[PDB]
Write a sequence for this structure.
């Protein structure tokens, strides 16, 4: 089924929010299939944020995403992409609603805790998952509790 | 004797370990439990609970779901209680329920959507569902003292 | 398998701790098979606390257990009786360790939140479950997640 | 920012044991406590705090409530705090507040709505409410080192 | 009881955003907040607070720490509070504290052990520490109505 | 470069939705994550991880369990970290683990006991298990700034 790249940004890691974020996505019933603590180098960052290469915030973006380790993940479940952006709330954490990840934990745009593939960008999920993870690092399993999450 | 609403952790809620989490949002919200029963819904009881959907495609699978494992059936009392419960639960379809609600936090399905609560917008749905699942000998008439601090 | 009678006392109910207690016992992997919000009358109380009928605290005990509603339960799982008294902690909540129900939520002996059949009293569990619940009120089901809780 | 706002757990939040949850909420949001006092509010102080309401029918009910038990008074600081805190609280009427907010998880009353927070849409309310509850000697000037991860600048 | 104890989130607990968790812990235990102040501790006050330690080798490191950032000072009241609070905290050395206690869930240092609480085994420590941090005008006398369910008498 | 311990949410931890809850107790405790990998353990890898129990009755069922679903494999850094982790996890047999520990709170079995962490009392178990499950290219050398407030 549908998967999406999700990553806890260096602010999240530094602020010790990996658990809380993982718990939010497990508790929503979703299935972790890839998971990796790693540091993003500047060539990986440049390739990740490519779409923003002309923007005035780019150099600060790569600077930040490269400023400490992240926890990179793939998640699978029904409608996962969009479900995950709903959990995360709005991109600017100062605008995110309470009960979402950024509404609860951030109030900044740059240091906004987390990233999730944009479902409105068709193919963003598969392209980012293939950026961060090799097929060898992604795990096919059956989460048994899926029989009670879904009809 | 204030406003009561019927509320049900569905078999998926029970399977996934979520009874206490749901109960905790109801009491934390300040609502009072007056009935509470762990039970299996038999097929007649579900025909009656879901009589209004008998014509609809999803009916058969709805009756099979709601009888496919035990439920936790509840009655909850408090000011504007039906509607407060519908807001805590969020959208019937959990893929659209807002994060912070019970379905936005815990579910990713419309059939397997954790819980039921009476629809305040269907007039007398509460009184009827309560009366369907509970005898008046299993509702409990009590005063929750912290009520004195929940309301003015 | 083994079941045990567990009940949230009127202090627990009044203090809005039913959820938290239920969650603790579901999260430990145990299976709810009976569950009932009810009031204990004085004949049920007298029969429940019979063993304490001579003690100086009896009349205060029945008075309290009868002072508001309780939430009466049966729980099943491996070694359930003893596992549950371990969750509850010590009878006097002022002596219970932090991380147990009474260590976290009480500090009184009388108003000590909760009751669980005493595993050291052989047959206490079956005798109390049959006191509070008829066989019609207890549910036989398969909690699927039991396949991951137990070998 | 040096942006500060005044925040108060009201006598109901205090009585229901929710001082800690409200504080975790604000801390977890990355906001910096700079003032904080457990205290009783008396007649004069409530009449001034609420005086914008002196001509209103719920006024006497309100001074009676806000004076019926202790409150936890506070000041918090951070980017857009006054506004962020207001969003965290939810609608003034808890029965209208969205689940996820303080009021939507914990209240369903208008009078007993847990909590108060300076109105960002009333210019000066924050600095006025703070100077009401706190002398400048009771506010702390410090650096929450985690701020460098909450914010980029 | 009128049994009160002095409790302090230390500068590490304050910086790590744990004021709220510690307060929820105490509230949830059914204990009554009667005093509470966010504040900075200076030289004189620490030298007196800790003076039983004036002759010890960790003393200078300790005044430096307890003075390196703000603390949340408190007073709590209830049955056997001083002792209950001490058990809630766990061993003074967090790396020795049992999981379930404040120190065992959140610390693993001796210097930076989150929190302080009057020693019930030192007679007078509670009433002495409280009078140290609080004037009697800053303590509140009230009735937590839930107390009637926490206790039978 | 301080003390590191290897820690593993076992397949049951992963199935039951407990990865984040465990990770949250490790970070809340102040320990630093330096490695972290969601993976399936193959049979050779489990022969090596459990070589010391190869003679024992429970070995075969142990290798079948630990390969029966994916795991979350971690490395954790901090003062006295091996032993701090063994205390957070509590007794190997979860029916005896104390409430407050990860096993006392979440488990009721000895085989299905949620997590593994290196035994501080077996000298060099940490360095060896870490080296077994992680290449040195997947350990991350970083400074967690709130360390400045966790320790003196
Ligand atoms: N003015 C801006 C815009 C975006 N950004 C950051 O760059 C990231 C990617 O931007 P984006 O438009 O793809 O937003 P999302 O897909 O993450 O919602 C955001 O998450 C922001 O953190 C920023 O720092 N400043
Ligand atoms: N296509 C549909 C529509 C509803 N249903 C289920 O049947 C239930 C009752 O539908 P309903 O519109 O009366 O919803 P509620 O009153 O529970 O909000 C829902 O909770 C859905 O779980 C379904 O399974 N499939
Ligand atoms: N001195 C005492 C002893 C017991 N009790 C209460 O009576 C209950 C039953 O006593 P018990 O000796 O069977 O203790 P448990 O089986 O509940 O551990 C306890 O839970 C106490 O609440 C009391 O109020 N005062
Ligand atoms: N009709 C009303 C309106 C407000 N109030 C109370 O009075 C307070 C102050 O009114 P307000 O419009 O300034 O509300 P906020 O500034 O707290 O959002 C509220 O928090 C309500 O508790 C009331 O009791 N009845
Ligand atoms: N060897 C030691 C002993 C204590 N201390 C610190 O000094 C404080 C006071 O010592 P204490 O024996 O009165 O400890 P408590 O009364 O807080 O249990 C402790 O909380 C430790 O933080 C230290 O830094 N080094
Ligand atoms: N009879 C036994 C004993 C141990 N074991 C399992 O094998 C694991 C390793 O045993 P161990 O004594 O080396 O324990 P730890 O180093 O993980 O504390 C345990 O975590 C138990 O789950 C078992 O399945 N059956
Ligand atoms: Mg984009
Ligand atoms: Mg309907
Ligand atoms: Mg007994
Ligand atoms: Mg071993």
């Amino acid at each position: 089924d549908e998967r999406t790249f999700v990553m806890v940004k260096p602010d999240g890691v530094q602020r010790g929010l990996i658990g809380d974020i993982v718990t939010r996505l497990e508790t929503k019933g979703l299935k972790m299939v890839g998971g990796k603590f790693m540091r993003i180098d500047e060539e990986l960052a440049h390739e990740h944020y490519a779409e923003h290469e002309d923007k005035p915030f780019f150099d600060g973006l790569v600077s930040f995403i490269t400023s400490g380790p992240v926890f990179a993940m793939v998640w699978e479940g029904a409608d996962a992409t969009r479900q995950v952006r709903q959990l995360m709330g709005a991109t600017d954490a100062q605008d995110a609603a309470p009960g979402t990840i950024r509404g609860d934990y951030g109030n900044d745009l740059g240091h906004n805790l987390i990233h999730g593939s944009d479902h409105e960008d068709e193919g963003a999920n598969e392209r980012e998952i293939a950026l961060f993870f090799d097929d060898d690092e992604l795990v096919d399993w059956d989460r048994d509790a899926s029989a009670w999450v879904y009809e």
In short: The domain at 1-152 of chain F is CATH 3.30.70.141 (Alpha-Beta Plaits). Residues E 58, 62, 92, 110-111, 113, 116, 119 surround cytidine-5'-diphosphate (ligand 5) (CB under 6 Å).
